[PDB]
Amino acid sequence: TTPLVHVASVEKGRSYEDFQKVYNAIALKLREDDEYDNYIGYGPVLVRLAWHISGTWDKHDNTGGSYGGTYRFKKEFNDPSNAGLQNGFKFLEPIHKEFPWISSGDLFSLGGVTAVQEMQGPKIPWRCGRVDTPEDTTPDNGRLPDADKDAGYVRTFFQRLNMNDREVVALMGAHALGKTHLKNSGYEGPGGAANNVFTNEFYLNLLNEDWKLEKNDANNEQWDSKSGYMMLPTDYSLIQDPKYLSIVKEYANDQDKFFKDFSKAFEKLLENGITFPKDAPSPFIFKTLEEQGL
Amino acid sequence: TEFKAGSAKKGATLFKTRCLQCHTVEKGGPHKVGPNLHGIFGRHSGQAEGYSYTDANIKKNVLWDENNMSEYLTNPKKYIPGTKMAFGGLKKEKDRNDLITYLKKACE
Numbered sequence: 001t002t003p004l005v006h007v008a009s010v011e012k013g014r015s016y017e018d019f020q021k022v023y024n025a026i027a028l029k030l031r032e033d034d035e036y037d038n039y040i041g042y043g044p045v046l047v048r049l050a051w052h053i054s055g056t057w058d059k060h061d062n063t064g065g066s067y068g069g070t071y072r073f074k075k076e077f078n079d080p081s082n083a084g085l086q087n088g089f090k091f092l093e094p095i096h097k098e099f100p101w102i103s104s105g106d107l108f109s110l111g112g113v114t115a116v117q118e119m120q121g122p123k124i125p126w127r128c129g130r131v132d133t134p135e136d137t138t139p140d141n142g143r144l145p146d147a148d149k150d151a152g153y154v155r156t157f158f159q160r161l162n163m164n165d166r167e168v169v170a171l172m173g174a175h176a177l178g179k180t181h182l183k184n185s186g187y188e189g190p191g192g193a194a195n196n197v198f199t200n201e202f203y204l205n206l207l208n209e210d211w212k213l214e215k216n217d218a219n220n221e222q223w224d225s226k227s228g229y230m231m232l233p234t235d236y237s238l239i240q241d242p243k244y245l246s247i248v249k250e251y252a253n254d255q256d257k258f259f260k261d262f263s264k265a266f267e268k269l270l271e272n273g274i275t276f277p278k279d280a281p282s283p284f285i286f287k288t289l290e291e292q293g294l
Numbered sequence: 295t296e297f298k299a300g301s302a303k304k305g306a307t308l309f310k311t312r313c314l315q316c317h318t319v320e321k322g323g324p325h326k327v328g329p330n331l332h333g334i335f336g337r338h339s340g341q342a343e344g345y346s347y348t349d350a351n352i353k354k355n356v357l358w359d360e361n362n363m364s365e366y367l368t369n370p371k372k373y374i375p376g377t378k379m380a381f382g383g384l385k386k387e388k389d390r391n392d393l394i395t396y397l398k399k400a401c402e
């Protein structure tokens with residue numbers, strides 16, 4: 001029988017300019033709604049959204065993944081590991097209303113791409129063609145990673161996303177963005193002083209800050225710094241593992257290398273489980289608002 | 295000056311959220327990620343001792359006032375190329391007016 005194959009189907013009559021306008025719609029609302037989450041902005045939660053909708057993928061049977069856009073259903077919407085992402089969906093809802101032709105998958109992942117670039121991150125190539133799928137295609141809860149584990153768990157988990165050691169260290173650098181909320185995850189605090197601008201701070205702070213394993217007000221254990229930063233047990237497991245450590249030091253001294261590696265691994269994350277036809281358009285690279293004179 | 299005036303109360307909440315993580319303002323304020331901003335007005339860029347600036351910040355040598363600060367806080371890296379201040383920018387004129395109003399009081 002062979003498992004499902006999700007073929008990229010371009011939105012009828014839409015091209016680069018059309019998707020550029022969706023980009024600008026997302027990028028503009030990012031500026032207007034700049035007071036969200038104590039002026040952190042909707043940036044971080046939008047890339048967390050794109051990661052959680054792509055992180056449901058299973059390489060063994062091509063179930064989950066961002067193709068179906070099945071996060072629009074309650075079963076995935078109310079996943080305990082997806083607490084706080086409602087702000088992200090609510091953010092994109094007027095944008096979906098303005099562009100009703102775009103699929104949920106394409107919109108969610110584009111939100112991911114858009115805010116990284118708008119937060120002065122690397123350019124991330126993005127491909128349209130995702131198609132909505134019925135409610136029965138919505139994957140069960142528990143496919144998203146656990147925060148209270150070690151290096152062995154992380155490496156093993158990301159095997160299901162076809163990610164290697166170099167791929168997961170670069171992706172994890174996104175944890176320099178935003179913060180953990182106690183009422184969402186059971187963890188509290190930012191990972192650095194700059195959490196709405198895309199940098200390599202996650203790797204620097206992981207090597208240069210002194211961390212002490214404590215117990216927060218939710219009785220959970222997290223690594224805290226004297227500066228007031230926090231790291232999840234999985235985050236800290238990157239400098240505990242000798243192979244992960246080497247890559248951490250690499251991205252710490254070379255943000256350029258980090259950017260190019262993140263751009264690769266992030267796109268691959270959003271496109272996992274998608275078959276792009278031979279006739280499919282080459283990946284889009286949207287110019288930023290700053291590159292549009294704004 | 296094209297800088298009008300804002301709310302020092304709004305600016306206070308704007309500084310504690312978007313500036314405080316890297317900047318102190320009181321006298322004897324400790325050098326953190328960014329330098330202490332006490333008496334930043336009436337002083338050229340990159341001249342507070344104890345802090346390690348970039349070469350571009352020093353060579354800019356701009357006499358800080360409410361106006362050139364507005365340019366800088368709008369887009370930090372365009373006004374001064376090569377700066378290490380990782381900041382998106384105050385893209386709203388009100389937030390600029392509000393914060394500069396607060397800073398002026400705090401930098402006293």
Ligand code: HEC
Nearest residue numbers: 193194312313316327328339340341347348351377378379
């Ligand atoms: C870190 C995460 C910062 C945030 C957020 C803000 N600032 Fe900053 N600032 C930071 C650094 C690392 C530097 C030095 C840059 C260099 O190239 O040396 C600065 C610099 C300034 C300055 C100039 C100081 C001088 O010329 O002597 C000013 C006036 C300043 N920063 C103000 C400022 C304001 C008002 C901010 C938020 C509203 C803000 N900074 C954010 C680090 C960081």
Ligand code: HEC
Nearest residue numbers: 044045048051084145146147171174178179180181184185
């Ligand atoms: C490519 C992006 C990306 C990847 C991969 C990723 N995260 Fe994150 N995650 C984020 C971002 C961005 C935030 C901050 C969201 C915010 O600030 O609203 C976040 C937040 C979180 C939170 C707290 C959410 C909240 O609202 O409190 C947890 C828990 C978490 N991540 C766990 C993990 C674990 C465990 C892994 C892997 C083993 C992982 N994440 C991988 C981007 C990512």
